[PDB]
Design an enzyme around this catalytic site. Structure first.
Site, mmCIF file in Angstrom:
data_model
loop_
_atom_site.group_PDB
_atom_site.id
_atom_site.type_symbol
_atom_site.label_atom_id
_atom_site.label_comp_id
_atom_site.label_asym_id
_atom_site.label_seq_id
_atom_site.Cartn_x
_atom_site.Cartn_y
_atom_site.Cartn_z
ATOM 1 N N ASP F 205 0.842 -1.309 0.173
ATOM 2 C CA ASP F 205 0.173 0.015 0.026
ATOM 3 C C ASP F 205 0.969 1.167 -0.061
ATOM 4 O OD1 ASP F 205 -3.402 -0.401 0.928
ATOM 5 O OD2 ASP F 205 -1.930 -2.011 0.548
ATOM 6 N N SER F 206 1.938 1.244 -0.863
ATOM 7 C CA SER F 206 2.698 2.662 -1.075
ATOM 8 C C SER F 206 2.756 2.832 -2.875
ATOM 9 C CB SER F 206 3.990 2.437 -0.633
ATOM 10 O OG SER F 206 4.672 1.395 -1.532
#
Ligand SMILES: [Mg+2]
Ligand SMILES: [Zn+2]
Ligand SMILES: [Zn+2]
Ligand SMILES: [Zn+2]
Ligand SMILES: [Zn+2]
Lengths: 44, 240, 115, 77, 66, 526, 35, 98, 240, 254, 98
Positions: F205-206
RNA sequence: UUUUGGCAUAGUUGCA
């Protein structure tokens, strides 16, 4: 010591001792004038 | 009242003895970094330049610590303070006196935290042994703590905005203690369920599932490119 | 704040060597060329040209870290031919290739403009 | 009359290496033939591998008694 | 706020087309036809003129502080 | 009901409920009751007719408005109490047409189901294709998103303000956005996003971002912070005066510079300031004198944008100093779609390093593929496809939730007409080696929002400094600095480690060491 | 005579636009304060 | 001052009896983006009270159809207690029953 | 490093095409849903005619609820299985699920075929209104869509009633996350503060601060949980 | 063991883009040439903006950033110009920069459009390429923007303002003969403009002995350089980089 | 004179009532600003709508935090006057306790 | 010539 009135945009030389008020409209919000220093930005 | 001062979550015995604010601690956002070993943590340059470790002057490091004293706080890596044998403290961001910059054995230089320093790395809430683990500092030129992707799942961390804390042991015995007890390679297997706490994670796990398929074939240049990234490679290209 | 200056991805600072050679002790006739302030531009092209050589037993490159600016090129060769010689020959081959490409591109421009 | 284990516990290794690295940092004599070693921790590790650390671990049993083990006496894991 | 100078993705010049884009829209062009007339083929460039909101026109309603 | 629908003696907001089973008629008129308008239905027919729609088309220059619709007895306000006695049709097009009967007695009909949503949930494109926790997360994140919060931000002096350089209205929009004024004050940018695994900095989740796009002002923002201060006169105990403190006349100062200020003790606008520079030189008289001048926050930095001076309520002079700080996207800054796809910038790559299509398009952003499956944010993918269709067609796409005229099949057929793969995939080339990537990448425009949580506003470290006055421990004041609490959880964690020396060092040596003298005979500190 | 289903999609949003033109988004606060 | 203080601090009731006063009614308006301003202006707060302990209010109830937003609520220890009005929802201002 | 660098050649994505099934699969799913709705209607008609008989230990409402719940559960998992069979090998949802990197088979079924029953406190959606779940149904309607069985996949998009019931379902997830965090640490702190002083003494016994024998040997064997592992006793199960 | 003999074929040449084909080359050389198009061709772009007076609605950094993105005609002057960091001066002499002056006062009531036309250069060879013109800022009655800025030589690696390309399309193997990409359903994919298959095939038959070659390029210039100038300067710069690397390698070996 | 009442912005008594967008620009007020808030000491304060139980209505519950099987509450309150609301309960004693 | 600082509340928000 120059300020600009917020309403009528009059340049007023106001000392540090007296109250601040527009000298031809009476408005009571004054903005300092832009600095005369040397300002530079890289365009990045 | 006095009774109110000691009771409760923020009392003196529960707010200021079991827990308390500590010097030499930093916090910031985490971001991924597959190019770091699992025992390495990326650190911003500013945090490293703000944080310090007391290194005792010996005849082996006299020249190196003298150079760091010459650099001072303005230049990274440098030092903040010199603690002499008498205990008096000389600050380096204000004193250009060359007599004060003399070093001798027994002096301590609070040098800026540099590469290879051991740091405890923590994520609140701390739920098990692997929520605080030792890492090796790697200075990288941005404002986040870069981490390997495998160390996310023991911390239960994701890079969705999560912050993480970094405590620097300030003494050699504590540094050795973290080296021998709390380093994340030592923390691979948990005693909770006698298994690894960390495994292979999202992208590399999907990609190694696809990689070990029977019909994955790699030509000569491709395998030569891949073997560069294999650190333990003995240098012999296997027979195709 | 901690953002690095944009110029320090192609500029060598004081006392930084552009290229450094180190023999690889694991395998005979193997060397590692660490070139600073470079990227995939030179790494991939030099790797490909080295792979075109028949006497090169191994040729690969990697960037150790994208935020840092280095390329480590490992070159292993037959015992009768040094990695340094292969590296120099590969660069001369690439230079000749690009010079010929420049001449032919100029000729093509002149024909298209005249046409 | 020693009843404790002959193996160095991980905690014993940690504290022994820490204290000996500190002592080396205070210019203590070094009981191993070092070669360009500057970090006190690495020198202490070399000493521990050589079993040359001059420290005695006093293990307290849970009755007020104790046992004094030389670092050389214990089995290094 | 104001039309960007470059296309964010490809870097094509877009700042010299906002007034022309509005002028074409006043000529009763469909927005696709206007963007085609201005010569924006890649949808990255088309996105910027199609989605730009010109707030500087609204900011100029307020008198300046001089 | 006849009287209420005619705006007779009964006003509209009066609500009447007949409990037939209990033989009661409860009429309510008090305030606090919530209601909404519903179209009246009679004999399975809307009372709304084409004449009303024609009159409402010329809403201007006719003086026919909503109030005349209420007065015509076509639409009436129904409250949640009266809803129990209402049989309501979801849509007039099908729910009341003759068929195998489900219910032949409809009393009302919804105007549009999409109006059940609030304000922040109604900017979600295709929310009915999402998981509802992510609809909630987006409803929170749109509140947190950067944008032009108001058109008169230049005169306002709020304590914190964030303004995006180049906000854009979404390419894929909801009808309800027309009435929120989101089209006039958008909060976000349409970004060519490619959902692909890559070098590995987009994982967990970057986000990977295009450095060249940021160099072109992509998601560049400005952060305004305003410092206010007033000089007071409290009898003759003291007196504050705006003036630059001179190094000789005041015995209390800090090492920061005092030459930035003017003669009136105020810094002029258009001057850079670090995190310790002084902006308002204020001197309090000593019964010589002392200083109580204010400085910027320790981490902050910027240029003095504006400087206003005026009289407060009592008539004392006081000033407010707006400080501009240009924030460029960097590693750590948060970004989010309109679907709860929260993520920080893992790394920034130049345009050559980004992957590219056959036509030279590099994505502005790359997100991890694994952010989707557990999420089930299929609305994100449908937004990407619809945005690609919108950008190619040159028409703002429609993403009203409960609309059957649009579905993924129609969007794919429209996209196939423009010489693209019908499912939005494309053949991307590796930016490093130039080789074709084996799998074909799903890429297209998607509306992204920069959240206010920048890394620079949440990075801080401590070595030593302002301890407490009572506990003699670090405390927070003047900044985020002041150490982090080594709470009970960390204490027990290190107890589990067996790291007694490190635990003692944290809790005793490096938080608040002290030493006292105690008699040996008694036990009280002597 | 009556709104056909094909034109209903335009009709309903015309009604909603008329609603928000008349009322606005903050009728609650303003009407309560005026009362 | 009496209104002003109560609107300045958000403590409602008698000023000297603020110990048992309901707090947080008045909040500083959240000027970060226009959507946030509109969401804050259209906001409902459900206090805990004795009544909330008797039946669980955090859960999304059926009667909240069309009146408040079905999916909009802060996370943490405020889920379901802070709500936002639906778009067309309008609150009765009150009238005389005579 | 190696797998992340090979993935630049391979690459991995997720898109609309990975959530699309063939027309035959959609027709099969729709046939399954029609059959499920028809047999739910038959169960309702049996209940209304007093033909349904209660099972032992359950009232008639419980018997009906169990019947319809198992009906919708088998319909949901049958539709999910049929969608799973429709997946190609290049389908990225399947690639991420089989690797265990992210998601589950239930996620694929919900994305492709049927989101399934929405439940509140372990039951179907209750009658908040007077014998109704919403104003759009008739009183005393126990059908699937009436009580909150959403039949459209996330690809197909939910209807207004389906969307509202799904929001209801997710609200319990958010609330239980909140209460879990409210109970985070409390049980753990109580446990540790009961047990923090217990330690393996140098005679290998386990004792507390007051030096009382808790266990004569740790874990009744004296072995740490790090280096233990699962094995199978080869003589327990075989016959004589 | 030696270089290929690459062959060029220019398909199209306009004043805004050049389309060409390179055969008999490895993939790495072509990819590096595209990379050098994007990030290593030096041009002249505005840097060092000094603002004397700015009463416009857009703050100072906004105006400076917009000025930096204006492309400048640098067709023939950039090669003989020097990097300012290497020059021996006060960093701005004519041999390493080009001065620009903007001075706009909006006196009429109508909205004044400060465009790129209002940028006055001190060197005629370097002007904004549009001289519709690129809008810098809109001014109200009584507002003024007055500044002087310079323009230095740089390339796209340092900052995207110096990127001369407005999108470099690059392609190879249009029929997927090498199967470097594996279509799950190849029928669904549109044919590339360089494809040579009929309208019954979807991919060329697989070639095990194939190698990448015949790379198709379409280099679109933003305007600061002619596209042919972009390609020639790109090849010259890459050759210069390799020659400098050879020099340093020779010094290291000796 | 008896005091000063804060005025909600863009209400019927705020000076921005019914002003065209031009005049709002002349006063440096955003025409898209919805209003609906007070200005207290320069700070923009918004009153969050407080949810509470309806008055004057009989509500029968079944408590089991007490000795009653059922309880009929009625929070009776005066109309427009006498804000203190009088809550009466009529309970049925539980038959289990005997 | 070497400083520094309001305590206690209430609200909002981020991550777990
Ligand atoms: Mg997180
Ligand atoms: Zn004036
Ligand atoms: Zn573009
Ligand atoms: Zn004593
Ligand atoms: Zn010069």
């Amino acid at each position: 010591m120059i300020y600009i009135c917020g309403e009528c945009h009059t340049e007023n030389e106001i000392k540090s001792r007296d109250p601040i008020r527009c000298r031809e409209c009476g408005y009571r919000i004054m903005y300092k004038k832009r600095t005369k220093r040397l300002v530079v930005f890289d365009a990045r | 009242s006095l009774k109110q001062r000691l009771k409760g979550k923020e009392g003196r015995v529960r707010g200021n003895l079991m827990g308390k604010r500590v010097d030499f601690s930093a916090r910031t956002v985490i971001t991924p970094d597959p190019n770091l070993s699992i025992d390495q943590v990326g650190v911003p340059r500013s945090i490293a330049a703000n944080m310090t470790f007391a290194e005792i002057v010996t005849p082996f490091n006299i020249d190196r610590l003298q150079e760091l004293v010459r650099r001072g706080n303005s230049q990274y890596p440098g030092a903040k303070y010199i603690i002499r044998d008498n205990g008096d403290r000389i600050d380096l961001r204000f004193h250009p006196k060359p007599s004060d910059l003399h070093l001798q054995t027994g002096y301590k230089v609070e040098r800026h935290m540099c590469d290879g320093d051991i740091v405890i790395f923590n994520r609140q809430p701390t739920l098990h042994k692997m929520s605080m683990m030792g890492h090796r500092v790697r200075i990288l030129p941005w404002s986040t703590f870069r981490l390997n992707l495998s160390v996310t799942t023991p911390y239960n961390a994701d890079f969705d905005g999560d912050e993480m804390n970094l405590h620097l042991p300030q003494s050699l015995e504590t540094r050795a203690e973290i080296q021998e007890l709390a380093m994340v390679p030592r923390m691979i297997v948990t005693p909770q369920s006698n298994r690894p706490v960390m495994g292979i994670v999202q992208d590399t796990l999907t990609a190694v599932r696809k990689f070990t398929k029977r019909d994955v074939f790699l030509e000569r240049g491709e395998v030569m490119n891949l073997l560069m990234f294999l650190s333990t490679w003995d240098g012999k290209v296997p027979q195709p | 704040m901690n953002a690095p200056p944009a110029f320090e991805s192609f500029l060598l600072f004081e006392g930084e060597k552009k290229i450094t050679i180190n023999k690889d002790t694991k395998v005979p006739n193997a060397c590692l060329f660490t070139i600073n302030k470079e990227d995939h531009t030179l790494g991939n092209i030099i790797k490909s040209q080295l792979l075109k050589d028949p006497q090169v037993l191994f040729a690969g490159y990697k960037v150790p870290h994208p935020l840092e600016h280095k390329i480590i090129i490992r070159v292993q060769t037959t015992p009768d031919y040094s990695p340094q010689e292969a590296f120099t020959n590969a660069i001369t081959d690439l230079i000749s290739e690009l010079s010929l490409l420049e001449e032919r591109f100029r000729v093509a421009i002149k024909d298209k403009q005249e046409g | 009359k020693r009843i404790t284990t002959p193996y160095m516990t991980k905690y014993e290794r940690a504290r022994v290496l820490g204290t000996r690295a500190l002592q080396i940092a205070m210019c203590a004599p070094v009981m191993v033939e070092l070669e360009g070693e500057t970090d006190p921790l690495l020198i202490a590790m070399k000493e521990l591998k050589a079993r040359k650390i001059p420290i005695i671990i006093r293990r307290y049993l849970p009755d007020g008694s104790y046992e004094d083990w030389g670092v050389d006496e214990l089995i290094i894991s | 706020m104001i039309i960007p100078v470059r296309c964010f993705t490809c870097g094509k010049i877009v700042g010299n087309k906002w007034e022309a884009y509005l002028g074409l829209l006043q000529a009763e062009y469909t927005e696709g036809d206007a963007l085609d007339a201005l010569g924006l083929k890649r949808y990255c460039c088309r996105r910027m003129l199609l989605a730009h909101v010109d707030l500087i026109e609204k900011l100029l309603n307020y008198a300046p502080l001089e | 009901r006849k009287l209420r629908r005619q705006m007779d003696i009964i006003v509209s907001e009066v609500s009447m409920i007949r409990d037939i089973r209990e033989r009661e008629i409860r009429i309510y008129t008090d305030a606090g009751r919530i209601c909404r308008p519903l179209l009246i239905v009679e004999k399975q027919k809307l009372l709304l007719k084409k004449r009303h729609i024609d009159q409402l088309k010329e809403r201007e220059y006719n003086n026919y408005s909503w109030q005349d619709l209420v007065a015509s007895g076509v639409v009436e306000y129904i409250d949640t109490l009266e809803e129990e006695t209402v049989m309501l049709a979801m849509t007039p097009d099908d729910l009341q047409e003759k068929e195998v009967a489900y219910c032949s007695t409809y009393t009302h009909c919804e105007i549009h189901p999409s109006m059940i949503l609030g304000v922040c949930a109604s900017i979600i494109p295709f929310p009915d294709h999402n998981q509802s926790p992510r609809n909630t997360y987006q409803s929170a994140m749109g509140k947190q998103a950067m944008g032009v919060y108001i058109t008169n931000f230049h005169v306002r002096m709020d304590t914190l303000a964030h303004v995006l350089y180049y906000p854009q209205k979404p390419l894929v929009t909801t009808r309800s956005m027309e009435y929120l004024r989101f089209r006039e004050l958008p909060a976000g940018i349409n970004s060519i996003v490619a959902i692909a695994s890559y070098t590995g900095y987009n994982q967990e989740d970057s986000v990977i971002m295009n450095r060249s796009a940021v160099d072109r002002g992509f998601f560049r923002s400005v952060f305004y912070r305003s410092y206010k201060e007033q000089e007071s006169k409290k009898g003759f105990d003291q007196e504050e005066v705006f003036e630059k403190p001179t190094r000789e006349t005041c015995q209390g100062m800090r090492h920061a510079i005092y030459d930035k200020l003017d003669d009136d003790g105020l810094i002029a606008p258009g001057v850079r300031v670090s995190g310790d520079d002084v902006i308002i030189g204020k001197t309090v008289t000593l019964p010589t004198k002392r200083d109580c001048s204010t400085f910027l926050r320790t981490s902050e930095t910027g240029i003095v944008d504006q400087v206003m001076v005026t009289l407060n309520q009592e008539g004392y002079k006081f000033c407010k100093i707006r400080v501009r700080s240009v924030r460029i996207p960097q590693i750590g800054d948060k970004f989010a779609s309109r679907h709860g796809q929260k993520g920080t910038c893992g790394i920034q790559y130049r345009q050559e390093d980004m992957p590219f299509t056959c036509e030279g398009i590099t994505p502005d952003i790359i997100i991890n593929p694994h952010a989707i499956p557990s999420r089930m944010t299929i609305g994100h993918l449908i937004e990407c496809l619809q945005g690609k269709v919108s950008a190619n067609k040159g028409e703002i796409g429609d993403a009203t939730p409960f609309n059957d005229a649009v579905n993924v099949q129609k969007i794919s057929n429209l996209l196939s007409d423009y010489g693209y793969h019908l499912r939005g995939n494309e053949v991307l080339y590796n930016g490093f080696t130039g080789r074709k990537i084996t799998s074909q990448i799903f890429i297209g425009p998607t509306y992204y929002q920069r959240l206010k949580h920048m890394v620079d506003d949440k990075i801080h470290s401590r070595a030593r400094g302002p301890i407490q006055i009572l506990n003699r421990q670090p405390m927070e004041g003047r900044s985020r600095d002041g150490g982090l609490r080594f709470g009970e959880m960390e204490r027990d964690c290190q107890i589990a480690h067996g790291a007694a020396q490190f635990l003692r060092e944290r809790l005793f040596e490096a938080s608040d060491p002290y030493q006292v003298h105690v008699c040996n005979l008694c036990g009280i500190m002597a | 005579d009556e709104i056909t289903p094909d034109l209903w999609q335009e009709a309903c949003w015309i009604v909603i636009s008329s609603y928000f033109d008349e009322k606005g988004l903050v009728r609650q606060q303003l009407d309560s304060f005026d009362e | 001052d009496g209104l002003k203080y109560s609107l300045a601090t958000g403590n409602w009731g008698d000023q000297k009896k603020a110990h048992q006063a309901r707090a947080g009614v008045s909040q500083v308006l959240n000027r970060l983006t226009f959507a946030s301003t509109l969401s804050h202006l259209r906001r409902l707060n459900s206090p805990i009270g004795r009544d909330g302990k008797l039946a669980k209010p955090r859960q999304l109830h059926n009667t909240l159809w069309g009146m408040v937003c079905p999916a909009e609520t802060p996370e943490g220890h405020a889920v379901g207690l802070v709500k936002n009005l639906a778009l067309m929802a309008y609150i009765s201002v009150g009238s005389q029953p005579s | 490093t190696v797998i992340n660098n090979w993935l630049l050649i391979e690459g991995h994505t997720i898109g609309i095409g990975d959530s699309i099934a063939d027309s035959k699969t959609y027709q099969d799913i729709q046939n399954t849903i029609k059959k499920a709705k028809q047999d739910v209607i038959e169960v309702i008609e049996k209940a209304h005619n007093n033909e349904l008989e209660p099972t032992p230990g359950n009232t008639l409402r419980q018997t009906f609820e169990n019947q319809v719940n198992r009906i919708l559960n088998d319909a949901r998992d049958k539709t999910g299985s049929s969608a799973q069979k429709s997946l190609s090998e290049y389908n990225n949802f399947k690639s991420m699920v089989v690797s265990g990197a992210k998601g589950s088979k239930i996620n694929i079924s919900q994305v492709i075929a049927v989101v399934g029953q929405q439940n509140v406190e372990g039951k179907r959606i209750p009658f908040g209104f007077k014998h109704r779940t919403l104003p759009h149904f008739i009183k005393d309607d126990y059908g699937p869509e009436s009580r909150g069985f959403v039949e459209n996949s996330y690809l197909a998009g939910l209807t207004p009633t389906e969307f509202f019931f799904h929001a209801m379902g997710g609200r319990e997830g958010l609330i239980d996350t909140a209460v879990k965090t409210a109970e985070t640490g409390y049980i753990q702190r109580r446990l540790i503060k009961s047990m923090e002083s217990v330690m393996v003494k140098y005679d290998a016994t386990v004792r507390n601060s007051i030096n009382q024998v808790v266990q004569l040997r740790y874990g009744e064997d004296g072995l740490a949980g790090e280096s233990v592992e699962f094995q199978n006793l080869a003589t327990l199960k075989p016959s004589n | 063991p030696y270089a290929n003999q690459p062959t060029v074929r220019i398909t199209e040449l306009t004043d805004e883009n050049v389309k060409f084909i390179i055969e008999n080359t490895d993939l790495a050389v072509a990819n590096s040439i595209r990379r050098v198009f994007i990030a290593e061709v030096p041009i002249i772009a505005i840097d060092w903006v000094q603002i004397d007076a700015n009463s416009s609605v857009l703050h100072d950094e906004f105006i400076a950033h917009r000025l930096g993105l204006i492309p400048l005609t640098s067709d023939d002057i950039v090669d003989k110009l020097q990097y300012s960091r290497d020059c021996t001066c006060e960093e701005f002499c004519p041999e390493c920069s080009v001065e620009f002056t903007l001075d706009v006062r909006c006196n009429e009531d109508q909205t004044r459009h400060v465009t790129s036309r209002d940028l006055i250069s001190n060197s005629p060879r370097v002007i904004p390429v549009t001289s519709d013109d690129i809008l810098i800022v809109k001014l109200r009655k009584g507002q003024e923007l007055r500044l002087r800025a310079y323009a230095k030589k740089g390339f796209g690696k340092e900052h995207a303002k110096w990127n001369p390309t407005a999108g470099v399309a690059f392609e190879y193997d249009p029929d997927n003969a090498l199967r470097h990409t594996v279509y799950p359903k190849p029928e669904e994919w549109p044919k590339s403009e360089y494809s040579e298959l009929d309208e019954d095939e979807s991919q060329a038959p697989y070639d095990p002995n194939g190698k990448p070659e015949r790379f198709y390029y379409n280099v679109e210039s933003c305007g600061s350089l002619r596209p042919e100038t972009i390609v020639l300067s790109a090849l010259s710069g890459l050759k210069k980089k390799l020659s400098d690397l050879q020099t340093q390698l020779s010094h290291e070996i000796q | 004179f008896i005091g000063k009442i804060p005025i909600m912005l863009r209400s019927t008594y705020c000076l921005l009532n019914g002003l065209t967008d031009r005049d709002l620009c002349e006063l440096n007020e955003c025409p898209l600003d919805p209003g609906g808030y007070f200005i207290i000491n320069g700070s923009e304060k918004v009153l969050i709508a407080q949810e509470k139980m309806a008055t004057n209505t009989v509500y029968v519950f079944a408590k089991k935090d007490s000795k009653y099987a059922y309880t009929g509450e009625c929070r009776s309150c005066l109309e427009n006057s006498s804000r203190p609301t009088s809550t009466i309960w009529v309970s049925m004693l539980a038959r289990g306790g005997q």
